[PDB]
Amino acid sequence: GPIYPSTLRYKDRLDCGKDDAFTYNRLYTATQGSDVWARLTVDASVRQSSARSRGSFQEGQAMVRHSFKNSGFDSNTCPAVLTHSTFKAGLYSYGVPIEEQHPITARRFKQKQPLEFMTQIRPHTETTNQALRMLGTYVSDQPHADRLGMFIPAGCPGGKPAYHPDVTTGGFGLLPTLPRRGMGATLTDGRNLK
Amino acid sequence: KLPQWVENDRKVLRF
C-alpha cells in the first residue's frame, strides 16, 4: 500500500484506471496528509517492506583460488617430512635461559614447578627419571645450585663425579652415529651416518 | 610478455 503513485509502473496503473478508477483515485488522494515528513516516513516504510519482500543474493558464487605456478602437479604436492632436527626436546629453547633469570625468581619458579625447571637445568635429559634423578648426579648442577641458593648435601650420591650413562653430558657421552666423537667427513669414518 | 606456463609449455630439461 504505497501512498505515492511513484512506486507503480506506467501501464500497471493505466490498466488499474481502465479497470477500477476507484483505487486509481485513492493512490493520488493518499497524499492528503498535512505533514510531508510523515508521508516521507510512510514512503520509506513501504519501500522498506518491498525490499524485505525481495531476497538477498550472495556475491561469492564463483570461488577464485590463487595458484603458485598454475599447475595441478605443483598444487597437489605436499612437502615430504624431511627433518634433520634434534630428537631431544630439551635441546630446544622453549623458555628464557635460567642463568640470566633472577635467583629468587628461579627459586619460586621451581617451587611452583619442579619439572620444567629440572628440564632446563638438564637440557640433555629426555626421560622423567633422568631429570628428577638427583641434584648431585650431574656435575653441572652445582653451579646452578649455588647460584640459586640451593644447598647440596655432601657425598650425593657418590664423591666420584659420574653415574649418568644414558645421557651424554660432560665427558661421558658418545653420539650413536658411526663417527663417534663427531667430525665425520668421509665414508671411511661414517660421514655422520649410522 | 606472456605467462610462464604458456611461454615454455613443452620445454623440458633432460640430463
Binding site: 516516513t41 520509506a44 629453547s93 623458555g95 628464557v96 625468581t105 | -
Partner: protein, 426 residues
C-alpha cells in the same frame, strides 16, 4: 594478580589501544618483538596484569581487537608493536557498519558478538582473579558505539560483580565529523548509564584545545590525542602495577567517586603537559603539578568546571614525594574555592601516592573529577537529537534494522532525567 582485560572497538578504539599498548610496553621495558629488555625488577612483578607468558619470554597483551573494517587491522599490524598481538584475539567481521548504531547493534553484532564473547570469556577465565574490564571506543561511529555497547551489555550479563572502565569519546557540535552523531551518541549514553560502572568522558575538541594551547604543537594529528588518552589509561591504573605509600585500585576510586549509582560520568586531565619552549621555565614540584591539575585548560572534557560544582574528585600521584605536601595542597584547594565544591560532602578529594614515575619522568599525576558540569554536553547533544528526531530525519536507516522509535523516546527520557538530576545536585 589483579587482572585487567583490554577491549578495543572500532577504528578509534583500535588506534587508542595500539598507542596505549605501545606506551605500556615502553613502561615495562618490552621490545616490539615481545621480549623483556628492561633494567629494574619492579617491572617483572606486575606484568601479569597486562601480559601473558607464551614461550621464551613472549609477553602478549591481554587485549581483544574487534571491529568491522580491515583497514584498522592492517594499520595495527603494520606499525610498531603490531607483532605482539595474538592473531586469534583479532576477532573481526567483514561487511562494516558505516556510522549506523542500529547496524552495529542488531544486524551485524548479532552474528559477530558470539565469537567476541567466546574470545573474551577465554581471556578472562584464563587468569585467576579478575580486577575488571576496560573498553575504549567512540560514541559517533557504528562499529564502536553499537557493537561495543552490545558487548558491554553481554559481559555485564555474564559477569555482574566485576568492575569496568569505559573510555569513550563524545562527538561535539564544534568538531563534528559525521551527520548522525547525536543519533548514535544518545542511544550509547542511554545504554551506558544503565550498564557501565563508571565512564571516562573524552572529547576530541578538548584534546585539540590542549594540543594547540598547552602543547603548542604545529600538526596535532590523531596520534597526539591517542597519546594523551593512552597516558591517562596508564595513569588511572598505576597503583596496580607498582607499589606506593597509599595504594588505590579501581574499586577504591569507584567507591570514592560515586555517591549515587547513576552519577558515574567523570572528567579527566593529565599532568604535566607543557610545550617544548615552556619546559625550560618550569620546575618539578607538587604545587606545579596540582596547579595544572585543577586548571580547566588541562581538562580533556569539553565542560568548564566553574559553571558547576565538584561532587567528588581524585588525584593519582606518581614519583617520590611527601604525603604532607599532597595533603596540604588538597586541603588548600578545597578551602579556597569553597563555592565550587558541594556542601554536604566534606573532603571531596581522594588522594593516593605511587613511588614509581613513568619512565623518563621525575613526577606525574592524574585527575578524575566527578562534577555536575558534565551534564551540559548531554544538553547540547539532546538539543540536536530532538532537532533531528522531531522531524524524523534519517530515521529510515534505523527503523529498517527493526529498531522502533520507542528506543529513541526512552533514550531521550533517560538522558533528560539524568541531566535533570545532575542539575538538581548542583
Amino acid at each position: 594478580m589483579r587482572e585487567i582485560v583490554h577491549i578495543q572497538g572500532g577504528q578509534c578504539g583500535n588506534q587508542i589501544g595500539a598507542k596505549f599498548w605501545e606506551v605500556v610496553s615502553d613502561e615495562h621495558g618490552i621490545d616490539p618483538t615481545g621480549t623483556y629488555h628492561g633494567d629494574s625488577d619492579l617491572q617483572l612483578e606486575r606484568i601479569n596484569v597486562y601480559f601473558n607468558e607464551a614461550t621464551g619470554g613472549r609477553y602478549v597483551p591481554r587485549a581483544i581487537l574487534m571491529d568491522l573494517e580491515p583497514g584498522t587491522m592492517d594499520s595495527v599490524r603494520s606499525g610498531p608493536y603490531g607483532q605482539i598481538f595474538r592473531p586469534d584475539n583479532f576477532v573481526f567481521g567483514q561487511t562494516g557498519a558505516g556510522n549506523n548504531w542500529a547496524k552495529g547493534h542488531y544486524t551485524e553484532g548479532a552474528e559477530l558478538i558470539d565469537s567476541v564473547l567466546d574470545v573474551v570469556r577465554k581471556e578472562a577465565e584464563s587468569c585467576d582473579c579478575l580486577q575488571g574490564f576496560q573498553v575504549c571506543h567512540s560514541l559517533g561511529g557504528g562499529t564502536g558505539s553499537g557493537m561495543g555497547t552490545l558487548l558491554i551489555s553481554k559481559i555485564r550479563e555474564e559477569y555482574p560483580d566485576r568492575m569496568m572502565l569505559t573510555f569513550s569519546v563524545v562527538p561535539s557540535p564544534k568538531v563534528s565529523d559525521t551527520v548522525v552523531e547525536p543519533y548514535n551518541a544518545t542511544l550509547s549514553v542511554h545504554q551506558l548509564v544503565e550498564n557501565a560502572d563508571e565512564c571516562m568522558v573524552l572529547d576530541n575538541e578538548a584534546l585539540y584545545d590542549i594540543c594547540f594551547r598547552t602543547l603548542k604543537l604545529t600538526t596535532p594529528t590523531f596520534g597526539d590525542l591517542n597519546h594523551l588518552i593512552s597516558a591517562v589509561m596508564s595513569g588511572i591504573t598505576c597503583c596496580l602495577r607498582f607499589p606506593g605509600q597509599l595504594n588505590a585500585d579501581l574499586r577504591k576510586l569507584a567507591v570514592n567517586l560515586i555517591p549515587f549509582p547513576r552519577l558515574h560520568f567523570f572528567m579527566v586531565g593529565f599532568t604535566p603537559l607543557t610545550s617544548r619552549g615552556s619546559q625550560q621555565y618550569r620546575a618539578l614540584t607538587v604545587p606545579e603539578l596540582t596547579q595544572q591539575m585543577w586548571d580547566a585548560k588541562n581538562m580533556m572534557c569539553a565542560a568548564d568546571p566553574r559553571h558547576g560544582r565538584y561532587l567528588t574528585a581524585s588525584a593519582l600521584f606518581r614519583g617520590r614525594m611527601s604525603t604532607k605536601e599532597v595533603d596540604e595542597q588538597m586541603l588548600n584547594v578545597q578551602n579556597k574555592n569553597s563555592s565550587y565544591f558541594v556542601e554536604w560532602i566534606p573532603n571531596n578529594v581522594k588522594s593516593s601516592v605511587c613511588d614509581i614515575p613513568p619512565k623518563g619522568l621525575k613526577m606525574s599525576a592524574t585527575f578524575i573529577g566527578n562534577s555536575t558540569a558534565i551534564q551540559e554536553m548531554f544538553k547540547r547533544v539532546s538539543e540536536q537529537f530532538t532537532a533531528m528526531f522531531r522531524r524524523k530525519a534519517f530515521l529510515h536507516w534505523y527503523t529498517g534494522e527493526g529498531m522502533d522509535e520507542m528506543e529513541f523516546t526512552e533514550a531521550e527520557s533517560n538522558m533528560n532525567d539524568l541531566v535533570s538530576e545532575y542539575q538538581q545536585y548542583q
